[PDB]
Amino acid sequence: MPVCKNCHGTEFERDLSNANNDLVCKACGVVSEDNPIVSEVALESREATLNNARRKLRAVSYALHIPEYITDAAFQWYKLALANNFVQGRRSQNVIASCLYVACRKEKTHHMLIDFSSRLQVSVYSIGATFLKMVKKLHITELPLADPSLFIQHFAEKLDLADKKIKVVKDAVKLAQRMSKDWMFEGRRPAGIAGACILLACRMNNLRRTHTEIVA
Amino acid sequence: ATLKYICAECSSKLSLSRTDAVRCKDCGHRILLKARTKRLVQFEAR
Amino acid sequence: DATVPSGRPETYIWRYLPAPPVCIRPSVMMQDSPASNEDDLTVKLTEI
Amino acid sequence: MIVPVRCFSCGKVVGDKWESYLNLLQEDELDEGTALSRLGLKRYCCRRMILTHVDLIEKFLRYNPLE
Amino acid sequence: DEINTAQDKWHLLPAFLKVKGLVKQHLDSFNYFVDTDLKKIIKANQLILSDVDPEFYLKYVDIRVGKKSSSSTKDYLTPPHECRLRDMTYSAPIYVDIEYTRGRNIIMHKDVEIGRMPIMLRSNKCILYDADESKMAKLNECPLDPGGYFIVNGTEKVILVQEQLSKNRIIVEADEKKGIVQASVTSSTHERKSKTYVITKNGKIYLKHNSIAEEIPIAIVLKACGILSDLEIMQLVCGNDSSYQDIFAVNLEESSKLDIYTQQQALEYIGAKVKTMRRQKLTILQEGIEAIATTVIAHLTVEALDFREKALYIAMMTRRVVMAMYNPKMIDDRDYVGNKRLELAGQLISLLFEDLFKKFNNDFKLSIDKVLKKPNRAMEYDALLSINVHSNNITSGLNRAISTGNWSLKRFKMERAGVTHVLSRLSYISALGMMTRISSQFEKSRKVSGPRALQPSQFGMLCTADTPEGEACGLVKNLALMTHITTDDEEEPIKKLCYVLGVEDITLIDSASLHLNYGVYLNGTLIGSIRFPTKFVTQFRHLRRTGKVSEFISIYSNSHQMAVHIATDGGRICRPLIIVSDGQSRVKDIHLRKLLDGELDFDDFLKLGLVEYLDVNEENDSYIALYEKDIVPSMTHLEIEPFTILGAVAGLIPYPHHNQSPRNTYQCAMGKQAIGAIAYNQFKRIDTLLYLMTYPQQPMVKTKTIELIDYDKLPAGQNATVAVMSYSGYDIEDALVLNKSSIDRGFGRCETRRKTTTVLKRYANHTQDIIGGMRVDENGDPIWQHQSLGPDGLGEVGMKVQSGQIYINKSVPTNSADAPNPNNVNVQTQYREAPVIYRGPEPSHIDQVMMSVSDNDQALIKVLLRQNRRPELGDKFSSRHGQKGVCGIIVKQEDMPFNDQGIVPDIIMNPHGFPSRMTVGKMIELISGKAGVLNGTLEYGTCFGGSKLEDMSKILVDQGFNYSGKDMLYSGITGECLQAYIFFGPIYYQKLKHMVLDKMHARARGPRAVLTRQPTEGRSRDGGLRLGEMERDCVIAYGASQLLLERLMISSDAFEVDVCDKCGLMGYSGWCTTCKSAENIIKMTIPYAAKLLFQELLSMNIAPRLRLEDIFQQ
Ligand SMILES: [Zn+2]
Ligand SMILES: [Zn+2]
Ligand SMILES: [Zn+2]
Ligand SMILES: [Zn+2]
């Protein structure tokens, strides 16, 4: 940032060799600063509601074992979501719900909106309402594309079986890949084709599992 | 081989794509070391 | 002694409370991410 | 780790005889002191390292990459 | 081959230790916890119910860890060692089974996780548990690591055995002035509560219990305690005649001058003086106002329904104070172990648990209220998955405790800290060194010398050989080799049994007791005072040693004090040893062939009635002999071996019985710093700072204690052939002198291993911190400042890295903390590259790097660096015997003696150290060494035992070396016979931490702290050193002014303050700013600490105005 008071060069280097840590120019060798001083060691309606939303927010978070990380991104959406007063007269749940869901979509992770809902009374519809509604108000389009390759993973772990499934995974995905090019894939709950291909490769791996335990 | 690095339990040659996954392609086992560099190195024994 | 440099026994009780400099109460290193640690006097009187 | 290649005083090479030592003990069961003697170490500081020096490198090779 | 009755008892200690392990303290208490006390805690609170919707309940039933009822051990978990690399926390999940109330006809159940428990390596539930040498391989982990240490957050920590003062027990202390406080502090379950008692003044004595207001005459309480006969109080607490008559009646007076008759009002005097019930419940203001307190004041030890027990208990307590007022002494210090009870991790983690679980329930209630507040349809809702969202407070909160060491117990309102540690691996000895370490705590202030010294009662039940200097706020001890810390047992059965033997209930008792026999105290509570005490004892002890109520439940008679005690308490120290019936032991010498065959082992002698566990009390009542060689049929027991007394650390020292003990203390304070081989998984694990040695060797003379800790399979040290001579003149005090062409042949070479963790983390802007790199200007080669990487930008294996280079390239995003918006097109890509630089005095090498993912899915990179230090001048060595020294000149080869064989003494050591330190043990160890290497046999030595010296001669003298260790030598310099004999053989010199290349330090002018602007502290950060007022004074005596002004002024903070002569205050540049002038200011210099002292002061209201005058011309 600064310039040598003599050489008028802009290139500065802090020499760490001899435990000075001086800053110098590679040009004339004059020092900028020696002695490298270093450090060491109210009433708002908005504070209440906000920090309350980090409470309620963080609550539903580790319930789904999502990254605690993503919570902070979602929360600030909630921040911006309050800026338009979109968050006022609706059910607090449905609000923060979409507020988290839109985040975990933006990261392309595996949590499906159906799973997100069943924490509640809710119909996976009222949430479907609120989510699709904030799509309008806060202006967002491109980001949230869900894809099969993610769901099979989080599925695969809960599917018991054995280490074979990894192969099955490698098996199933290439399967699901062609089905997408088999042009049957659109217009479908991605979970459906997910568990579908899973059952497929599982049968192809000659292991016998029910239809129920799958949709579990 | 000459490629980049190795599993822990698989002990298998694994080359990784830039920001691909931290998993090992073969085993589901996660952690991975970095295999030896093919480049020369000099010691003086004494 | 009052030749009144101080001007009698009335300043003994606070009226205008002297805020200390920043170099006495340095804000701790900003560190990675927004909150830099407070440094005592920066919180007490800022509450006062 | 591995038997050193010379003692820490003499400088006679002990690196060799560790194999021939242990082999000479297991096959042909024979007592220590007599063993090392006809194994050819009269000076005792040359001798300790044969006698001393647990061999770890085996116990370190359980952990290799391939298993 | 008949086995000698003398030593054959040796074969015990292994068989003891073989099945029941060395470090079983931390295991059992744990394995007892998970298998039991969980099924208790929930059995305490199994029902949470709100106030609302009168039909609901939540009924716990079972708790399980890792077992959901699929297989016995959990079908899958994460292997601990691999769990150590990822910074994870080794965990097994909790499983609970529940009953709901949801909708019509449900009352259903499940198997559910409330969260995860950090179990302990080589516990019951661990994967490692019961796995032999094969799983050990496949799990990539050490066989010989004793375990019993947790692992959390990837670091590696231990709950340290915590001593605690005896709880629910009598104690009587006297003092100058005072008047001899008595105290009984009782606790279980709810309300840990103290009750003090003492005299206030002059024979007029009172109960202080902070639950009451101030005090009560003990006569009043004892009346209200439900013994109303008054003057029979005197007959009870006092005695028959002796002196005691008068001293107590003086007290009994002031009850007469006031009030009486507990039937109503005598109780009323108490509740009259109690504090309030805090509004509601006050309804009990009555004559039964205080009838609550008279059973629960402090004592939860008795309580019950009618009063007589607690009454007479408080009585018998009041006896012991007036006994003290009679004469000092005849009282109880708090020193000898029987009055102190250590306690393991078992009760700790539960106490912490039932809190966290308790908060879990209180709050899970309040979360089940929100749903049931506002009616929607008919409110049902599973009201069950909400445990997931509302959990962790059980888990993450638990990890916070176990890692940090802050335990906040709301239920006891009692907080303790410094209770865990990083387990320090500098040696295989330290591995079990931090393990099995007694941390005493409390100790009030330091100024009392009482809770310090080493009490003779400690014999064999605690290591006598270390009490190191990390004392500070606490004390540190170690167990013995043979100790079994008694757990909790039981009470009601031993009670009714005691009656079965014919003790008579207190209710039947004469109400004249003290004359007749002694009395029988369960846990310090009076029961029967049975007829014929000794026969009662021998009868009971006879039962314990065979039929029933085994291990603990010790018993001991008493004389001066008249009592017989049956103690059932848990958390207490016990030790093994053999009973001698009549003259000889119970072994009978054919029993040991019947033993070492392997069909017998240990914990079988209890059922055979041979050995049992005594207690510091019991053994104090008993009589023990050392050797079977000396017995008299007055005896009871003989120790199985004398050298069990020295601790696991202490057992190292050869021939300890020839030393003076402070040397062994410094040795137990050293050997755990001996660098060593650590564990077999050494190279695979990645640790913070881990030394290790190139060519370790078995110590030439072992000890029967070493072989049983497997210390020779992980030896720490070199075995160095070492003269004893004065050489050079670089020698003097403790300073060794090493040998070139030896040190270069692979003697005492070290390595060192460091880890640098760099966590990569994503930011809310959705921007990943990237490792890209390798600039490479000017035709196909990186800049030298860079180099050592390779294409990946991460560091690479095996390449020499040097000073200011970069072993991992890292760059953060620049906007990371900004406000994420749904607006971007092109550049998220502006990066601030802040790579971590290597800095150090030497080169080093990158051996192994690790890319992995943490538990929460965020990228993690860990590299570890190595360097092999040649044992440079200035490196602490030890003799393992207490000699602690630094090498002097490193001579070449040619120099120093040799003699006839040609051998060159490797280490050469100053003689003077031996006489003034007066340690001849080593000086025998040398003989034993040279004798060993000739016969080709490791030759033993041990505490009270070991190879008899006088035969050592015979082994040498025929083989040509002097009957005593001395031998001729030829000074390398001259080459003529050394005019005096010299004494040398093999000795085991272990090399220590405090390698010099770490510890040397220098500064020219370094950074300054923002606040004081005077140099920062210690190594690491940067240089600068301390001049203390203790030291600073020194230069005053010499009288130097100019050296100070150079020192505390010019060289530290040199500073120009601009002040104003008129109305003296500071100011910047030209202005005074209190008086705007730009005239009267004078520039002068002053320590920046002094200015900082002004702006400090003047902030606070006070004004160091500076009157000034010129130097020259008056
Ligand atoms: Zn310049
Ligand atoms: Zn793999
Ligand atoms: Zn030699
Ligand atoms: Zn002025």
**CATH code, B40:** 2.20.28.30
Resolved by: cryo-EM
Neighbours of E859 (CB within 10 A): 19
Residues of B in contact with D6 (CB under 8 A): none
Distance CA E292, CA E103 (A): 43
Alpha-carbon distance B38 to nearest alpha carbon in chain A (angstroms): 30
Nearest by CB to E851, which of B22, B39, B46? B22
Domains of chain D, each with CATH number or no CATH: 1-66 (1.10.10.60)
A31-34: long-range contacts, CB 8 A cutoff, minimum separation 24 = A32/A2, A32/A4, A32/A5, A34/E1005
CA dist E332 and E324 (Å) reads: 10
Q: Which of E603, E604, E734, E1058 is catalytic?
A: E734
E734 is catalytic: yes
Please name the residues in contact with A175: beta carbons below 8 A apart, sequence gap of 6 or more: A197, A200, A201
Closest alpha carbon within chain B to E800: B41
CA of B2 to the centre of ligand 2 (A): 17
| Residue D10 labelled as part of a binding site | yes
Question: What distance in Å separates residue C30's CA from the closest CA in chain A?
Answer: 10
Nearest C-alpha of chain E: how many angstroms from D20? 16
- What pairs with residue C1 in β-bridges? none
* E393 Cβ neighbours under 8 A, 6+ residues apart: E356, E359, E360, E363
Chains D and C are in contact, defined as 3 or more C-beta pairs closer than 8 angstroms: no
E115: left (phi over 0), alpha (psi -120 to 50) or beta: left
- Answer yes or no: are the C-beta atoms of A94 and A122 closer than 8 Å: yes
How many angstroms separate the CA atoms of A145 and A153, rounded? 17
User: E1010 to chain C: nearest residue by CA?
Assistant: C26
B33 annotated to a ligand binding site = no
Quote the minimal CA–CA distance from E792 to chain B in Å: 9
Quick one: how far is CA E53 from the chain centroid?
A: 50
Given an 8 Å threshold on Cβ–Cβ distance, is D52 in contact with E719? yes
For residue E652, give Cα distances in angstroms to D45, E544, E706.
Answer: 23, 36, 6
H/E element holding E556?
strand E555-557
Contacts of B27 in chain A (CB under 8 A): 163, 166
Residue position matching structure tokens 């805020």: C19
Residue of E754, E717, E743, E749 whose CA lies nearest to E868: E749
CA-only gyration radius of chain C, Å:
17
Neighbours of E968 (CB within 10 A): 13
Touch test A–D: 3 Cβ pairs or more under 8 Å:
no
For residue E1081, the ligand closest to its alpha carbon is 4
Question: What is the bridge-based pairing of β-strands E162-165 and E340-343?
Answer: antiparallel
Q: Which residue of E has its CA nearest to C29?
A: E1010
Cross-strand bridge partners of residue B5:
B14
Q: In terms of Cα–Cα distance, which of E821, E353, E555 is closest to A106? A: E821
* Distance (Å, whole) CA D8 – CA D5: 9
Neighbours of ion ligand 2 (CB under 5 A): B 7, 10, 24, 26-27
Helix, strand, coil distribution of chain E in percent, nearest 5 = 25, 20, 55
Q: In angstroms, rounded to a whole number, what is the distance separating the alpha carbons of residues E978 and A61?
A: 82
Q: How many CB atoms lie within 10 A of CB E534?
A: 11
C38, amino acid identity: E
Give, for E198, the enclosing helix (H) or strand (E): strand E193-201
Please report all neighbours of B, defined by 3+ CB atom pairs within 8 A. Answer: A, D, E
**The three-state (H, E, C) secondary structure of E370-428, written as one string:** HHHHCCCCCCCCCCCCHHHHCCCCCCHHHHHHHHHCCEEECCCCEEECCCEEECCCCCH
Ligand closest to the CA atom of residue D36: 3
Q: What is the DSSP letter of E463?
A: -
Between the alpha carbon of residue E1105 and those of residues A151, C28, E101, E1097, the distances in Å are 75, 31, 77, 11
The amino acid present at A140, given as its one-letter code, is: I
Q: Cα separations (Å) of A65 from A69, A94, A121, E89?
A: 11, 19, 20, 16
Distance from CA of E429 to the nearest CA of B (A): 29
- With 0-12 / 13-18 / 19 or more C-beta atoms within 10 angstroms meaning exposed / middle / buried, residue E909 is buried
Token pair recorded at residue E935: 């016969």
The β-bridge partners of C11 are: none
CA distance E1082 to E487: 77
Rounded to whole angstroms, how far apart are CA atoms E576 and A78? 67
Closest residue in A to E1003 (Cα) is A19
CB proximity under 8 Å: E 687-726 to B: none
Q: Which residue in the set D10, D47, D60 is minimally distant from E902, CB to CB?
A: D10
Contact state of E852 with B37 under an 8 Å Cβ cutoff: no
Chains that touch D (3 or more CB pairs under 8 A): B, E
CA distances from E242 to E94, E328, E465, E560 (A): 63, 16, 45, 14
Q: β-strand E637-638 against E624-625: which pairing, if any?
A: parallel
**How many angstroms is it from B28 CA to the middle of ligand 2?**
6
Distance (Å, rounded) from C-alpha E508 to C-alpha E503? Answer: 11
D66/chain B closest Cα distance in angstroms: 6
Helix, strand, coil shares of chain A as percentages rounded to 5? 55, 5, 45
Count of domains for chain B = 1
Chains D and B touch (3+ CB pairs under 8 A): yes
Phi and psi based region of residue A177 (left: phi greater than 0; alpha: psi -120 to 50; beta: remaining): alpha
Report the chain E residue with the minimal C-alpha distance to residue D66.
Answer: E138
Interface of E with C (CB under 8 A): 812, 816-817, 1010-1011, 1063, 1092, 1095-1096, 1098-1101
The answer to whether A197 touches A172, Cβ cutoff 8 Å, is: yes
Measured between alpha carbons, how far is E1000 from E993 in angstroms, rounded to an integer? 14
Whether B2 has a binding-site annotation, put simply, is no
Check CB contact of A157 with chain B, cutoff 8 Å. Answer: no
B11 Cα to chain D: minimum distance (Å): 6
Q: Are E955 and E931 in contact (CB under 8 A)?
A: yes
Which residue pairs, CB below 8 angstroms and at least 24 apart, start in E623-630? E624/E577, E625/E580, E626/E944, E627/E6, E628/E5, E628/E6, E628/E9, E628/E584, E628/E585, E629/E6
Q: 3-class SS at E724? A: strand
With H, G, I as helix, E, B as strand and everything else as coil, classify residue A115. helix
Q: What are the chain E neighbours of C20 within 8 Å (beta carbons)? A: 1095-1096, 1099
Alpha-carbon distance of E866 to E849, in angstroms, equals 12
| Cα distance between residue E436 and residue E483, in whole Å | 11
Which amino acid belongs to residue E84? R
Alpha carbons E870 and D8: distance in angstroms, whole number: 14
Task: Identify the nearest ligand to the CA of B13 by its number.
Answer: 2
E903 to D9: CB separation less than 8 angstroms, yes or no = yes
Classify residue E452 as exposed, middle or buried by CB count within 10 Å of its CB (0-12, 13-18, 19+). middle
Contact at CB, D8 and E933, closer than 8 angstroms: no
Q: Decide: E822 and A137 in contact? Cβ < 8 Å.
A: no
- Interchain pair C18, E1099: CB under 8 A: yes
E795: its two tokens: 């560091």
List the beta bridge partners of residue E876: E886
Secondary structure of residue E625 in the 3-state scheme: strand
Note whether E366 and E462 are within 8 A (CB): no
Quote the CA–CA distance of E988 and E602 in Å, as a whole number: 35
Q: How far is CA A179 from the centre of its chain?
A: 27
Closest alpha carbon to E743 in E891, E884, E877, E926: E891
CB E859 within 8 A of CB E760: yes
Beta carbons within 10 angstroms of residue C6's beta carbon: 12
Residue E45: strand, helix, or coil: coil
Question: What's the DSSP call for residue E978?
Answer: -
- Among all bound ligands, the one having the nearest atom to the CA of E1076 is 4
Range of the domain at B33: 4-46
CB E186 within 8 A of CB E193: yes
Binding site annotation covers B7?
A: yes
Q: With the C-alpha atoms ordered E479, E481, E487, E493, is the resulting torsion angle positive or negative? A: negative
Q: Which residues of C touch A (CB under 8 A)?
A: 26, 28-29, 37
SS3 E929: helix
Q: What are phi and psi of A149, to 5 degrees?
A: -50, -30
Check if the beta carbon of residue E745 is closer than 8 Å to that of residue D4.
yes
> Which residues in A61-100 are b (16+ Cβ under 10 Å) and which e?
bbbeebbebbbbbbbbbbbbbbeeebbeeeeebbbbbbbb
Cα gap E183→E299, rounded to integer Å: 11
Residue E103's contacts (CB-CB under 8 Å, 6 or more residues apart) are E378, E380
Query: E204 in helix, strand or coil?
Result: strand
For tokens 């999502």, name the residue. Answer: A66
Residues in chain A closer than 8 A to C26 (CB atoms): 39
| Cα E1054 to averaged position of ligand 4 atoms, centre (Å) | 23
Which ligand neighbours the alpha carbon of C5 most closely?
Answer: 4
Phi (first) and psi of residue E584, to 5 degrees: -85, 180
User: In 3-state terms, what secondary structure has residue B13?
Assistant: strand
| Chain A residues lying within 8 Å of B29, measured CB to CB | none
Reported in sequence order, the residue ranges of A46-121 that DSSP labels E, i.e. its strands, are: none
Query: Could you tell me how many residues make up chain C?
Result: 48
Asked if residue E54 lies in contact with residue E47, where contact means CB atoms within 8 angstroms, the answer is no
Strand partners, E674: E992
- Measured CA to CA, the distance from residue A155 to residue A200 in angstroms comes to 14
How do strand E564-566 and strand E520-522 relate by DSSP bridges? parallel
Under 8 Å CB-to-CB from E379, ≥6 apart: which residues? Answer: E53, E371, E372
Query: E853: which chain B residues are within 8 Å (Cβ-Cβ)?
Result: 22, 30
Taking CB atoms and an 8 Å limit, are E140 and B42 in contact across chains? Answer: no
Site from C23, C27, C28 to mutate, E interface, most E CB atoms within 10 angstroms: C23
**Nearest Cα to Cα of residue E234 among E217, E224, E226, E222:** E222
Count of C-beta atoms within a 10 Å radius of residue E60: 19
Q: How many CB atoms lie within 10 A of CB C33?
A: 11
Q: What is the DSSP letter of E645?
A: G
Please give the Cα distance from E579 to E649 (Å, whole number).
28
Chain E's closest residue to C14, CA to CA, is E1101
